[PDB]
């Protein structure tokens, strides 16, 4: 919005003083893991006589 | 007698084949043909009859 950008700006005047402050900030990103599995089974007899 | 030893891959059965010789009263057909022709009911010369 231009009237609350021209409204928000940093003017600076003749004296000085502190009258401009600023800050920073930072955040954090997560990850993860698992684990995944399946078997099967048989008989000999199977495998023998198929 | 003497064993015999069977084969992996083809089941848990077996299986054989007998021949039944010609003069044998178990040799029942329909390929009997007389002396003359006249095509008659027995396949086998006079069966086992002594």
Do not use: C, W
């Amino acid at each position: 919005d231009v009237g609350n950008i021209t409204a928000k700006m940093p003017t600076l005047t003749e004296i000085g003083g502190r009258v401009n402050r600023v800050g920073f900030k930072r955040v954090e990103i997560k990850g993860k893991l698992e684990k995944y599995g399946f078997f099967r089974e048989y008989t000999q007899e199977q495998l023998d006589f198929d | 007698a003497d064993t015999f030893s069977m084969p992996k891959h083809y089941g848990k059965e077996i299986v054989r084949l007998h021949y039944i010789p010609l003069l044998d009263d178990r040799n029942v057909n329909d390929q009997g043909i007389d002396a003359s022709g006249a095509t008659i009911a027995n396949g086998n010369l006079y069966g086992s009859s002594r």
